[PDB]
Amino acid sequence: MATLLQLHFAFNGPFGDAMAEQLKPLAESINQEPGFLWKVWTESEKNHEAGGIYLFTDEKSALAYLEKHTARLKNLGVEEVVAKVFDVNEPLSQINQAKLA
Amino acid sequence: MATLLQLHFAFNGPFGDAMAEQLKPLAESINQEPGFLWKVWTESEKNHEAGGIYLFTDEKSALAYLEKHTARLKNLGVEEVVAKVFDVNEPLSQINQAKLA
């Protein structure tokens, strides 16, 4: 469905490599979630947060699947994954057309 | 600096039009934050959240400016706007090249 979803959590959930390397070949196994369209290529020790915004197979699975990721980090990691699915509010795209033009 | 920042708060902070319409001409006055590159074109009543991810003049001003937005909504709105600046973790961009290719 090419849904754009927010998916991020605090760093020090895993040590970090779980994202930087171990996300690539183990994502479907470790987090147990596919993604379908693309994956999260975000990590920020300086921000103490790891994750970003990426495309998920759909919105409905997306909010349920935060708990998929979260089931790991709630246990050994940190707090919870912040995942929501927003919608495009087109009126304000007027003020978008500077850098994204 | 074309910094990509997360900026979103819960809906029912403003009635909503503060984003949908009133953000466009009043953004610099209401929130009193410029943005520079582009603005946030997100609104989601179904998610009960309003805001998204957009480019800010820089990261340093970005985390300080959450409180700019927040000084309004902490007073009359909802909780606090969620704003963080993440970084690009390029090794996982391998798994990005499906839909963003």
From Swiss-Prot, chains A, B:
GO molecular function: oxidoreductase activity; protein homodimerization activity
N-terminal signal peptide: none
SUPFAM superfamilies: Dimeric alpha+beta barrel
GO cellular component terms attached to this protein's record: cytosol
Cited InterPro entries: Dimeric_a/b-barrel, YdhR
Pfam families: ydhR (PF08803)
Top EC group: oxidoreductase
Keywords on record: Oxidoreductase
E.C. code: 1.-.-.-
Function: May function as monooxygenase and play a role in the metabolism of aromatic compounds.
Subunit description: Homodimer.
Name of the featured protein: Putative monooxygenase YdhR
Organism name: Escherichia coli (strain K12)
Organism classification: Bacteria, Pseudomonadati, Pseudomonadota, Gammaproteobacteria, Enterobacterales
Chain's gene name: ydhR
